Structures are given as C-alpha cells and as structure tokens.
Amino acid sequence: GHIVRAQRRGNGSVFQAHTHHRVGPAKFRALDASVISGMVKEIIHDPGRGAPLAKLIYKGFDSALVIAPEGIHTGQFIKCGAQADLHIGNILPLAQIPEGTEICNVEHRPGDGGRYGRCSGDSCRVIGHTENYTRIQLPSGRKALVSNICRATLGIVAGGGRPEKPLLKAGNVHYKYKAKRHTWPVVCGIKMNPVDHRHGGGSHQHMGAPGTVARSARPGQKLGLIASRRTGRRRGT
Amino acid sequence: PKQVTTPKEFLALAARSDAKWVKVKKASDDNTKFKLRTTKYLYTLSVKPKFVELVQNSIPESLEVIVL
Amino acid sequence: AAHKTLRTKRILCKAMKVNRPMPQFIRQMTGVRHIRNPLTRHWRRRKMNI
Amino acid sequence: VDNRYTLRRSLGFHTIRNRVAPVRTPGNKLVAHYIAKRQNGPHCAETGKRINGIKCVKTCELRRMKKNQRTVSRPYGGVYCGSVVKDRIINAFMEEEARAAQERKMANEQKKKGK
Amino acid sequence: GAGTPSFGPRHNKTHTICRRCGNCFHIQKSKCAKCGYPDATMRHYDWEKKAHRKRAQGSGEMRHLKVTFAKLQRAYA
RNA sequence: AUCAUGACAGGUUAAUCUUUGAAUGCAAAUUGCGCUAAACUCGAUCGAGAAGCAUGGGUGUGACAGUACUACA
RNA sequence: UAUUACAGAUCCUAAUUGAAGUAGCGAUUAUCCAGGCUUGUAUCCUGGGGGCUGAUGAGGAGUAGGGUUUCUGGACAACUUAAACAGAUCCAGAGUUAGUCGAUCCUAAUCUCAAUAAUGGGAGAAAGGGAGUACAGUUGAUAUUCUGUAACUGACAACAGUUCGCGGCAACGCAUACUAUUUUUCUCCGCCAAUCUUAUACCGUUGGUAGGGAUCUCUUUCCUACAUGACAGUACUAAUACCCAGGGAAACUGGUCAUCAGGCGAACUGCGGCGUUCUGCUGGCAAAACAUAGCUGUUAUGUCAAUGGCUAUUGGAUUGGUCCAUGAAGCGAAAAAUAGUUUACUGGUCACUCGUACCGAUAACCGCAUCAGGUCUUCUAGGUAAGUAGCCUAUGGCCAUUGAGGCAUGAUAGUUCAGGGAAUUCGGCCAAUUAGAGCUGUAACUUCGGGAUAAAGCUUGGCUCUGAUGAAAAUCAGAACCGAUUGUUACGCGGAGAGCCCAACUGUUUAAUAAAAACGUAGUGUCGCGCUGUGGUAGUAUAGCCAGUGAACGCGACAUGAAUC
RNA sequence: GAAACUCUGAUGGAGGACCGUACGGGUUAUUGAUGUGCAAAUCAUUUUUCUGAUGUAGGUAAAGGUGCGAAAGACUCAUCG
C-alpha cells in the first residue's frame, strides 16, 4: 500500500495554512496587575476567520488585536479590569460577572490570550460560582471549571449566522479554502483503488469491511468512523 | 532653459562670474534673442528692434559675444 | 546573454580563443602528424554545457 | 508611413514601471517615452481625506522643493485637516477644563465640613 | 505528448558551475552533486572507486606534493 | 657563450608565489558589502595602496556582571 | 609447458555485398526577360515585368536559452536532398564605451546560522519595491553608453551676499535649523462595469504650395510632405473632487449615463482656497531635422490657415457593483507633536564596480539535424464587416521551394453530376441542406428563471431622391425607377423536430488506442476531540514539526451526491 | 385602486448565462492523410472552451516502499502495479 491522504497531512508541505494576508494573532494584552480604558481604533476583517477583529489602543500607544463582540463600534471606550462595569465590549474577570449570561473569548489559564468561544456567533454561558473556579458551559454542551482571576470579553461574537446561507457553487468553496488551507476537493475512499485507501477496490463500489474502528487502530488504519459509540439517525435524545 | 522678461535682470545675470558666452541670434517678427549661457541654465531674452542696439552695449565687455 | 555574469563571460572568452586550427610549426618541430586541437568545436553542432 | 516603435529599455514585459507613450520627435520619428509613476500624496488620519495645499509628487522630490510647499502652516499642519483639529481643540480643552473644575469641585465640596 | 512537444519549454538550468569542483552544483538545493560543496569534507564513496580516482590526487598538478616524493627517492637509493 | 666575467631543456635548495579551495573579515549563480594603534610605501597635516581582522579549544593577562560566600565598617 | 585447432551461439569486433543507378529528392508565394562578375548561375548581385507575405506578418525589438552565430575581406575539399563564384560553412583579422538603461541596494514565498546576559544576523526578484536624460549626428559592425547641444540627481568642500517671522475672518499663502522619542502619511496595491477627456494613430469636412505618377478619351485629378524631445516658466479662459466665508432650504430643491445629495447646513454668491487634468502663449527652437531649386562644400525659399470625430488604443479623472474571496513586505523619504540645543537660506569639484555585439524560432533555443513539433512578451496601417474573424492592398520584408518533358492508369485534396432520395451501411459514417440582419410569429412541458435563434413565414441589389433624430461630416425610416426574380451574390455564418437511458448543472481525467455513465461539486447525514487534548509526522537531540497567526457557526475522519416526493 | 399594492414603457447592467475571435487552453469525429513519417505521437478538415474551480511565466516547497493525485494505479526528465 501507499501512505494515505489522512497520514499525508502531517508531513505538511502543501497542507500548511495560507497565512500571508492574515493580520495577526488574535488575543488579549498580558495581565500586568485597577481598570484600564482602551479606544477601538478600528474594526477589520482578516482572511480565514469568519469573525471580525477589533484593534484596541491602550494609550505611547500599546496595541491589541482583540476578537470582536457584536455591537462594538469605532471610538467606543473598552474597559479591561475588575472594577469596570457591565457593557458589551468590556473585559472582566469571571469573579465579577453575573451567572446566566453570554461571554466571549474566555481564557483557560490566566494571562493566556483567550481560548474558548472565539468563532462567529458563539458564546460561553456561565453556570455558577463555586469559590475559585467559575464553572462555564462551552458552545458544544461540555462544562469546564475555569479560575475566577482569568478574563473574558462580554457578549456574543460578531458575524453570526454565516452558514445560514448556502454556497451554491463549487467556486464559492474554492475561494473559501484559498484563504484557509488546501484540504479540498475531497475524493472519497471507496472511489480509490485498494492500494490508495482502505475502502477502495472491488468490482462494484462498496466498503466491505465494517467501516468503524477503535482508538487502538494504527496510522493508515484509522479511516472512517473512529470509536463511534452510536451510529445512524440521532432520533430524539 | 529659462526666459527672462526684464532687460535689467538680464544684466544682473551677465555679471555673476558664472557666464561663459552670450549668443546673438535673429528671430521671427524681426526680433532677436540674447542667449546668456550659465553653468546651470541658459537664460534667453526676447526683445523688439527698438531696444536692440542699446542692450548689446549694456552687456559686459569681458564676456565673449558670438554672432549668428 | 545579454546580462551575463563576469565569470560566465570568462568561460565564453576562453571557449572562443581556444577554438582555432592547430599551428603549422608543431608538425614541423615534432614531426608527428595527425594531431587535432581537442577543444575545437562548432557552436551549432556541439553545445558546451557550461 | 510606418508608425511602429521599439521599446528602448531591455525589459520586455508590460509591468507598471515599464509603460510607454508614443511621442513625435523633432526629426519626425515616433518613439517610446516612459511614464513616471503616479502619486496619491498625503491623505489624513481620521476620515481619510485629501489635505489641501501640497502637491502629490514623490516624497524624495518633495525634499528638493522649498520648506514652504512641504507643509500647511497650522499645528498638526500635514497630518490633520482643519475640522479634525478644531475638534481636538474643543475636546482637549473641555477634558482638561472638566478635570480642572473637578479639582475646584473637590476643593469646594470638602470645605463644607469645616464651616 | 511526452516526447518531442514537451521538450520545447526546456530552457531553465537545474545545475550551475560549482566553485570547488568547477565541473552540477544544484541551484535550488545549493549542493555540488559531484563533490558535495559546501560540506567541508569532499564527497567520495567506496562503491564509486572507479570514478573517485579520476578526481583524486595524481590527476592534477601536484605542485607541492611531487617535490616531497622526490626527496624520499634521494634519501633511500 | 668559449683554457670562462661559464652556453643551456640539465639536477637540487631558496626566493617570487595570480583568482580559488579546510578557506578563515561578512557573503556569493554578485568580481557584492565591510574594519584598523603605530610602522611600511608611494602620495603634496591628510588620502590611498601594501599588510592585517574567522570559528573552536588550551595557558597566561586584563575587564565587566552577581541581594554567591565572608570579614571589617 | 599452455589464454593450444571453429561454419554455426537472434555470438563479439572490423570491413563488404545483392537489392540498386532502384525507392525517392518532401513541406514553404511563382516565376520570367535582358545585363554585370566569371572556365562555369534559373540560383551570386543590378534593372525591368509578374507574384507572395497582407500589422498575433518569415516586419521592427526583447526575457529565458545559445555564445561570436554579429562585421569586413578572401576561399569552395566538405556541408546547406541538383547547381554554386553564394551562405548561419571554412580561413584571417576586427567589434560590445553609461553617475541617469539594468545589476549593485530593499525585502516576499522560502532557506540557513547564532544567541537565550539573548528579542537577532545573513541569503533570497536582470518581470515586485527603487534618486536621476533627452534630442540631433556619426561607424563596415557600438549607442538613452561615443561627439555636439540642452537638462537632472546625489555626495563632499569651503565662500560670497542676504536673514534673525510675517500675510488671510477662513480654506490657505510666503524666506527658514538640528538630535532624540513617539505618532501618522507617501512608497501602497484584488477583479469587473460605466461615463468624461489629453496624447498617439486613423477617417474626416474647408482650402493651399512644393515635387513626383498618370493621359486615345475623361479626371482643376492621384500619391508623398505639411513636423518640435526631456526639461523650465505664468496668463486667463473651464472643468470636476474637497474644503472655507456669507446664505438658512416642503408649494421640497439641486444633480447623474446610473445609484443620489442636503439643518452633522442644500440651492446660490465670491473676480474664495487647493489638488489633478485642460486650452492658449512662450523659453528649449531652428542654429537642428526634412522637402524642393541652383552652385562647387554651401546659398536660397518653404514646412501654412481653419476645425470636427458617432472611430480605436493608451494615460488620467469621476463613480458604481461584487466577496462564508476583503486583495504583499521592507529599505527609504517627508511631516507632526512633545522635550532639549539653536540663527538660517540662496548661489566649485567628483561620481567607483560589473552587463551592453547578434538570434529570440522565420535555419541561431529544446527536440541527435538548417526537424511542417514545442517554448514567455512587446509596437500594431487602409477597405469590406458587429469585428484583433475571413478576404484584398500601401510602408517593411521577400521568390524560403532541383530543373527539362509528358498527362493514360492509380493515390490524395477538390468543384459538378439526369431520374430516385438512405434502397448503401453494424450505424445517415460522410457530405449536402440550413445560416447574417430587419419585420412578423413562437408549442407541449417547467424548479416559472427557462424552453427560444423553438418551429414556421416573409424582405435584402443598383440608381435618383424625400423625411425624421443629433452639434455632428452619422444612422434609421419611407418612395420612385431599373434588369436574366437576383441580391447574408465572393468571404464568413445553426440542418430542425419527436421519444427513451445515464449524470443534475460550470468543471476534472488514463502525456502516446478509453473524455465517459467515471472523478468532482453544492445539498443532506453520521462519527471523534474542549488543548497536559485530537488527527498526523519525525527520530535520538528530552530535536520540534503540520493542522495552529487555530478553538465546536471550529478542526479532523467517512458516506451519499442539485431540487421535488 | 377605498386600501394592500400591481399593469405599461424606459433606465440599469447581475450571472461558475449564451454565440464567437487567437502563435490562448483542451483534443470529439473523419477510425481522413502519414505509418522507409516533417514528427520515437505530426498534418488537414471538423469539433470543445474562451472573465472563469481560467490560462501562463519566473522564484520557491514536497523525493523512491517516499512524494503528489477534482482518483486514470495517473504523474515523478521519451523510463512507473
């Protein structure tokens, strides 16, 4: 057999991110001990990422490409800190914020940059305050103990509802993955011959083998549904 | 190559100790052009045949004068 | 060419001054006959590969 | 007649730097003359508008020109146009005047306790 | 398809003259295939023992080295 | 050039020793881009050429860094 | 004593037969006649016919590559499918001139060392960035490089004369330093579409003068020529963008080809401000260059006056639309602010290094070769026409191509064929018919967008006029009359309709027997994982690489393959 | 037209729309010519596409049980299960 397209993404020659026109890494300023006001100089769109970024100035002018909540405008004053009040814009630690509210770009570790809840039209919800660890629900469903000192932007991330509209033409998806990375178009494994992929070969196109494989299964062998505790139509539940 | 309107300003440019020659030259409409050479530029002076005779005399004696 | 480098130009010089007939007086001196200049060529037939 | 004309420079291709225009010589011969590049010249920060009172030439040949024609006379002469400078005066006055009146306020308010 | 027509656009040069070898210096990869420049050691293998002795000592002038052979004749004769 | 003030295709040793190469002032598909107390040599105090300047490690010499250890204030 | 005896091994190497004076001498417009030079020319040159190429040209020029093929002189043993005095062949000499064109300098994708007391250094583009040049002349070959003439840019020096901040309500104007820090701008950026306008080319209405061509007759005719560089200046005409002063808007007004603009201040008025374009007038500048006329190197006259483009290309201006697409960096330059130190501005010498000839496919490159193949780009005339089509022709370049004689048969590329009209054949394969434009007229079915140029009819020339719309020298409509009923005259231009199957669709694919129903796609669905993680890779250095400049509207793994049911 | 709005004409210039040029990109048919070729894949006529998932140049990245592959076991210097 040959090495399979799933294995070949590691070696990373043509399968690298197209990172040329990307404006910078989206994160907070570092922590550095109250309250600090910060004007939104402008809000710009970087390629690949569906969200906007908003370039702040903590005037020297110290810059920070923070990811943009919805309802931010140019020449708003954003207020990072503990004793900053509640507006959509402001960047509070999880000690201060009320529970049962939608927050954006929340950090895992303090002073980190921002980790959970970054893509367009997403938000971490806050469940409740234990003592040190403010428990929050992530967009998927999963729940996470996160320390109260670490920061999070208030409100929902901008650019919501982009997949509501379908892309009618193959050309629209060509321009989508030009900004991101080469991973498209996908040739299906059944169509390929036996050497190229596991599902390939045979007189008539069909999978033949069970098509559902363990965590223990090797490189080359992990193809199709990996460790699928259910399959088929998820009716109810 | 600049042109110079006033006959007085021409004679200031002539007596700089830059200028190597002046060239006299007949023109259309019975005019004539006094082309002062300088290291940088060539200063031309269009004149009518009323004040043609006086200007040549006005020019410094030392500077060489090539007639055409 | 044009836009040749200098050390490219050095090789093309040496390749054309070396291209000539063998002199007459070596055959008179040594008395050997049938020696050809090895670095003779024609531009159209054999390329240099330099 | 044949009015076709060669490129003079040894670059063949039709890039932005290698562009030509046909011109009649003194000798009745058409010939390539090469186009010098366009310049936008100084826009302003804030809004993004053209300031007046300066030519769009290259900034290198802006140096060769007189110091007069490089600038506009006011404070923030080149960078900011007129009405944006008016707004900076009004705000930077009344930000400082409110802060100065705050020092008058916290002087005046605390004196009520003594009397 | 793969023959005469596709020989047409063959104008770029893969290899260029090499400084140490002077012979096949790879422009993109920057290495002399024949001699291994710029590795400080000079390339030879025992599987090409034929091709090595074309390059190796004896082939050139030996300006310093021939006079040091000639001393050792005189001392032992 | 001949009984020598010694011919030259002789043989050594010593000079001179171009651009390179371990290649070594920094590079190189480029005759690209540097730096220097005196002395040297032309050039008429101040330019140029000539000749220097690599990395690694050894012994010596010097200088800097430290809320490392310690004494005397 | 042995590298010891050959007819064979599709044996090895070297030479040589028949076939055979046979197959064949292709492709590319077309050659003919008189002279010159010669032992000798259809071929090498001259002159004159007849032709071809027919602005994506065998025209004039360049990247990449070639490397002397360039140029002059002499030469024909060989080569250039015959011939040869010719040649990209042979031989002997000669030729490539730069501060302004390039390289050099900066970084991009990307590659490679070093430090971690570090926060980088270096490489990487002869199409990106990038200070600065033009004309005329000259050689057997070089020219934006040489000469003449006129500019311009940078760096390093002193030195002479001015000057120690003012105008406008405002937009802004006018003569002002340097170091540093920070901030901003220029450099500077996708694609598509529309309108307006310089320059160049071309066609035009009005004339004109210089020379040449044409002539039985006709033509106050036909052709050529009617031109001004970089650079520097300052008039008022007149534009659009934007801003300023007054002005203070519904009976809403102003404005575009189009969208539109306005109390966050419109119309409108200023001999406003300012940027970019424009017209005229100069300097450069007629001294040059070109065309006539005459004299033996140079003297004469002349290169003029008026004013349109519905035509094209280029530069620029004013805008719009489009994106789950938002379309380089760096060196460098100027400005501003805040400190501190202050006088400034205008007006001789020098400019290193390396490339520079010619070809650019048509014989100079890659295909073993002077190979009907292949290979990036530039300047782009007239007529016909919707035209960068096809067809014809000025400027420029050419006859690339063995000759002499025959003409039955056959091969191949072509026009045409009475009557029939697919009977031929596996099969309407092939060819024929259809065709451009204007005016009529258009069905079932449909995802309501399509189908649709559906189908099916008619008209089309020449000549003399008339009218409408524009500014307009253009284009459209209408009527007479004419003869072989014919007219998109050559050139170029769909045969059409009615069923059924497969894939929805634009797209991709076995370079060299398969272009499809195969692959792809949007759409639909399932599975894994919250970063100390997941899917990879990588290999001994406790190396760090890819998704990741990333975070579930995400990343990765599969399967189905638009919509409708 | 009581209204909600919808009839006629112009304006406008959207679309992985259509016809159609090339020394553009492909290569359907004649199973034509050639098959001692001009050519170790050509020529003629016909045909497909022609603002895009477009073509194309230079530099640059990926290397042999690997690479890359809108997948044909295709391609990786006339060489590839």
Tab-separated table of C-alpha atoms (C1' of nucleotides) in Angstrom, chain G residues 31-236:
chain	number	residue	atom	x	y	z
G	31	U	C1'	8.377	32.684	-61.623
G	32	C	C1'	10.067	35.413	-66.457
G	33	C	C1'	13.446	38.580	-69.606
G	34	A	C1'	17.854	41.426	-70.519
G	35	G	C1'	22.736	42.953	-68.294
G	36	G	C1'	27.141	42.630	-64.635
G	37	C	C1'	31.126	39.121	-62.441
G	38	U	C1'	33.185	34.583	-64.279
G	39	U	C1'	36.298	28.420	-67.240
G	40	G	C1'	31.116	27.959	-65.371
G	41	U	C1'	24.487	30.978	-62.456
G	42	A	C1'	17.222	29.909	-63.114
G	43	U	C1'	20.386	30.125	-58.175
G	44	C	C1'	25.516	35.419	-56.610
G	45	C	C1'	24.396	40.991	-57.499
G	46	U	C1'	21.865	45.238	-60.858
G	47	G	C1'	17.445	46.845	-63.842
G	48	G	C1'	12.551	45.762	-65.537
G	49	G	C1'	7.918	42.818	-65.690
G	50	G	C1'	4.572	39.004	-62.857
G	51	G	C1'	3.617	37.497	-57.834
G	52	C	C1'	3.634	36.436	-52.263
G	53	U	C1'	3.614	37.882	-47.094
G	54	G	C1'	-1.254	41.191	-46.138
G	55	A	C1'	0.095	44.545	-38.740
G	56	U	C1'	-0.634	37.753	-33.349
G	57	G	C1'	3.090	39.451	-40.955
G	58	A	C1'	9.472	34.877	-42.400
G	59	G	C1'	8.204	43.489	-40.423
G	60	G	C1'	10.907	46.188	-36.218
G	61	A	C1'	12.609	44.674	-30.967
G	62	G	C1'	13.329	41.977	-26.093
G	63	U	C1'	13.245	37.881	-21.363
G	64	A	C1'	14.853	32.559	-20.694
G	65	G	C1'	18.439	29.941	-23.554
G	66	G	C1'	22.592	29.951	-27.281
G	67	G	C1'	27.814	32.132	-27.134
G	68	U	C1'	30.575	35.010	-31.519
G	69	U	C1'	26.109	32.795	-34.935
G	70	U	C1'	27.357	39.947	-35.409
G	71	C	C1'	31.002	42.966	-39.190
G	72	U	C1'	34.577	43.413	-43.457
G	73	G	C1'	37.912	40.754	-46.641
G	74	G	C1'	39.487	36.243	-49.133
G	75	A	C1'	38.063	30.750	-50.025
G	76	C	C1'	34.754	26.113	-52.148
G	77	A	C1'	37.923	19.558	-50.046
G	78	A	C1'	33.110	19.009	-47.274
G	79	C	C1'	28.110	20.539	-45.728
G	80	U	C1'	23.409	23.770	-46.939
G	81	U	C1'	18.345	16.225	-50.681
G	82	A	C1'	20.636	19.044	-58.059
G	83	A	C1'	23.974	23.526	-59.137
G	84	A	C1'	27.044	27.468	-56.702
G	85	C	C1'	31.636	32.497	-57.693
G	86	A	C1'	26.595	32.392	-52.611
G	87	G	C1'	25.885	31.067	-47.180
G	88	A	C1'	24.279	30.885	-40.015
G	89	U	C1'	30.035	26.699	-43.871
G	90	C	C1'	35.866	27.193	-43.976
G	91	C	C1'	40.185	30.666	-43.110
G	92	A	C1'	42.426	35.502	-41.325
G	93	G	C1'	41.614	39.767	-38.841
G	94	A	C1'	38.093	43.307	-36.276
G	95	G	C1'	33.873	44.637	-32.908
G	96	U	C1'	30.216	45.257	-27.246
G	97	U	C1'	32.412	52.836	-24.393
G	98	A	C1'	26.956	54.731	-19.225
G	99	G	C1'	26.630	58.934	-12.177
G	100	U	C1'	20.772	58.935	-15.327
G	101	C	C1'	19.041	51.722	-19.000
G	102	G	C1'	19.955	47.254	-15.956
G	103	A	C1'	22.921	44.638	-11.999
G	104	U	C1'	24.623	46.712	-7.184
G	105	C	C1'	20.600	48.404	-2.545
G	106	C	C1'	15.474	46.581	-0.056
G	107	U	C1'	12.525	42.838	1.323
G	108	A	C1'	8.298	38.486	-0.478
G	109	A	C1'	7.226	32.974	-0.676
G	110	U	C1'	11.252	30.267	1.349
G	111	C	C1'	16.109	28.693	3.161
G	112	U	C1'	20.249	28.946	6.797
G	113	C	C1'	23.487	30.159	11.125
G	114	A	C1'	23.738	32.482	16.168
G	115	A	C1'	22.287	33.886	20.902
G	116	U	C1'	18.768	32.739	25.302
G	117	A	C1'	23.411	38.354	29.878
G	118	A	C1'	19.691	36.958	24.018
G	119	U	C1'	14.456	39.926	21.252
G	120	G	C1'	18.715	38.994	16.022
G	121	G	C1'	22.397	38.499	11.659
G	122	G	C1'	22.857	36.753	6.544
G	123	A	C1'	20.895	34.824	1.923
G	124	G	C1'	16.589	35.107	-1.422
G	125	A	C1'	13.425	39.082	-7.653
G	126	A	C1'	18.291	41.320	-14.541
G	127	A	C1'	9.193	40.924	-14.742
G	128	G	C1'	7.772	43.362	-7.361
G	129	G	C1'	9.952	47.974	-4.464
G	130	G	C1'	13.779	51.530	-6.269
G	131	A	C1'	17.035	59.184	-6.611
G	132	G	C1'	18.251	60.921	-11.615
G	133	U	C1'	18.184	62.057	-19.690
G	134	A	C1'	16.553	63.956	-23.617
G	135	C	C1'	17.022	65.299	-28.745
G	136	A	C1'	20.184	65.522	-33.283
G	137	G	C1'	24.531	63.497	-35.589
G	138	U	C1'	28.268	59.639	-36.591
G	139	U	C1'	30.530	53.591	-37.744
G	140	G	C1'	31.936	48.301	-42.102
G	141	A	C1'	29.962	46.242	-37.043
G	142	U	C1'	28.613	50.198	-30.650
G	143	A	C1'	24.946	53.620	-28.876
G	144	U	C1'	19.270	56.689	-23.958
G	145	U	C1'	26.651	54.300	-23.345
G	146	C	C1'	30.680	57.906	-28.155
G	147	U	C1'	30.606	63.538	-30.220
G	148	G	C1'	27.607	68.287	-30.116
G	149	U	C1'	23.716	70.687	-27.636
G	150	A	C1'	20.461	71.129	-23.625
G	151	A	C1'	18.907	69.102	-18.684
G	152	C	C1'	18.832	66.382	-13.901
G	153	U	C1'	20.140	63.671	-9.257
G	154	G	C1'	23.438	62.629	-5.156
G	155	A	C1'	27.745	63.269	-2.001
G	156	C	C1'	31.918	66.082	-0.056
G	157	A	C1'	34.176	71.085	0.493
G	158	A	C1'	34.867	75.913	1.688
G	159	C	C1'	32.937	81.036	0.314
G	160	A	C1'	30.181	85.444	-1.046
G	161	G	C1'	25.638	88.009	-0.337
G	162	U	C1'	21.093	88.067	2.133
G	163	U	C1'	18.478	86.979	7.115
G	164	C	C1'	17.418	86.832	12.774
G	165	G	C1'	8.572	85.668	11.106
G	166	C	C1'	5.301	87.815	8.739
G	167	G	C1'	0.020	87.988	5.438
G	168	G	C1'	-5.590	85.998	5.047
G	169	C	C1'	-12.232	86.346	9.018
G	170	A	C1'	-11.190	81.406	6.918
G	171	A	C1'	-9.848	77.414	3.344
G	172	C	C1'	-4.535	78.500	2.915
G	173	G	C1'	-0.291	81.542	1.246
G	174	C	C1'	5.221	83.355	1.755
G	175	A	C1'	12.416	83.097	3.095
G	176	U	C1'	13.996	79.451	7.410
G	177	A	C1'	17.712	74.847	11.530
G	178	C	C1'	19.373	70.210	14.351
G	179	U	C1'	19.457	65.481	17.773
G	180	A	C1'	16.013	62.102	20.041
G	181	U	C1'	11.499	59.799	21.263
G	182	U	C1'	6.659	58.552	19.791
G	183	U	C1'	2.560	59.065	16.152
G	184	U	C1'	0.872	59.389	11.109
G	185	U	C1'	1.403	59.631	5.865
G	186	C	C1'	3.602	58.773	0.926
G	187	U	C1'	6.034	54.321	-1.199
G	188	C	C1'	0.802	51.135	-1.461
G	189	C	C1'	-1.629	47.624	-4.020
G	190	G	C1'	-7.962	42.395	-5.930
G	191	C	C1'	-11.350	41.729	-10.060
G	192	C	C1'	-15.403	43.554	-13.106
G	193	A	C1'	-18.618	47.520	-15.399
G	194	A	C1'	-19.955	52.607	-16.984
G	195	U	C1'	-19.270	57.950	-18.238
G	196	C	C1'	-15.901	62.135	-19.491
G	197	U	C1'	-11.014	63.719	-21.506
G	198	U	C1'	-5.292	64.872	-23.077
G	199	A	C1'	-1.530	62.239	-26.126
G	200	U	C1'	-0.703	58.918	-30.411
G	201	A	C1'	-2.861	56.592	-34.707
G	202	C	C1'	-6.742	56.771	-38.254
G	203	C	C1'	-11.019	58.773	-41.006
G	204	G	C1'	-12.900	63.349	-41.961
G	205	U	C1'	-15.254	68.351	-43.851
G	206	U	C1'	-12.570	73.532	-45.657
G	207	G	C1'	-8.822	75.375	-48.653
G	208	G	C1'	-3.069	75.749	-50.268
G	209	U	C1'	2.221	75.047	-52.172
G	210	A	C1'	6.073	72.108	-53.057
G	211	G	C1'	7.913	67.759	-56.012
G	212	G	C1'	6.715	63.093	-58.490
G	213	G	C1'	2.967	59.390	-61.083
G	214	A	C1'	-0.912	59.084	-64.843
G	215	U	C1'	-3.321	60.811	-70.039
G	216	C	C1'	-6.533	57.603	-77.312
G	217	U	C1'	-10.649	59.973	-74.389
G	218	C	C1'	-12.224	61.601	-69.168
G	219	U	C1'	-10.049	63.391	-64.187
G	220	U	C1'	-8.903	71.951	-61.564
G	221	U	C1'	-7.164	64.684	-60.612
G	222	C	C1'	-3.733	60.726	-57.851
G	223	C	C1'	0.478	59.926	-54.393
G	224	U	C1'	4.213	61.713	-50.957
G	225	A	C1'	5.147	66.234	-47.369
G	226	C	C1'	2.798	69.911	-44.057
G	227	A	C1'	6.916	68.383	-38.076
G	228	U	C1'	9.176	70.094	-32.344
G	229	G	C1'	12.118	65.996	-27.298
G	230	A	C1'	13.247	65.619	-21.930
G	231	C	C1'	13.117	69.968	-19.224
G	232	A	C1'	11.503	75.143	-17.173
G	233	G	C1'	8.028	79.076	-16.931
G	234	U	C1'	2.791	82.156	-15.635
G	235	A	C1'	-1.551	84.022	-18.031
G	236	C	C1'	-6.630	83.994	-18.008
